[PDB]
Amino acid sequence: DRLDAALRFQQEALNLRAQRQEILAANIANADTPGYQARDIDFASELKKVMVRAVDLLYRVPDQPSLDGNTVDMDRERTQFADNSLKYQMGLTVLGSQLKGMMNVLQ
Amino acid sequence: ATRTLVTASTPGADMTPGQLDYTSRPLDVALQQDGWLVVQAADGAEGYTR
Known part of the structure; x- marks a missing residue:
């Protein structure tokens, strides 16, 4: 509702970034266990669904x-982790700027 | 498919006959090219040796 929805878009984006970060950290910590399949969430489609709305994670090719059945690749996971961290900080900065501007309007 | 592990393996054996020396002992025998003396193994089943 007005302020609520305008902030809600970025809040949901930030929450989705946090959940994706959790999944990435999980599959990086579990990178040395046989029989494990790397998982990830389609960030763009998931955000689009949530914006008009329990996440549907899917496997990674x-x-x-590897003989033991491990599909997580450390270099790709590290690059994705860094990208997600930068996106999270960018969203945090944008949200903080919007909130600070809204607060400063009342002054 | 790039990774290609390597595992050691041993075929049966080499059947080249070895060098024999003459000790003149009355009951020391040496086989032909593909000979085999049959003995009774511990379990009972017959085995072959040289």
Whole structure:
């Protein structure tokens, strides 16, 4: 509702970034266990669904086989983790700027 | 498919006959190219040796 929805868009984006960060950290910590499949969430589609709304995570394609059945690749996971952290901080900065502007309007 | 593990493996054996020396003992025998003396193994089933 007005202020609520305008802030809610960025709040939901930030929450989705946090959940994706949690999934990435989980599948990085679990990177040395046989029989594990790397998981991730389609951020753009998930955010679009939530904006007009319990996340539907999906598997990640392997790039080179391993006998033990592990599909998590450390370099790709690290790059994705860094990208997600930067996106999270960017969203935090945008949200903080909007809130600070809204507060300063009342002064 | 890039990773290609390597595992050691041993085929049966090499059947080249070894060098034999003459000790003149009355009951020391040496086989032919593909000979085999049959003995009774511990379990009972027959086995082959040289």
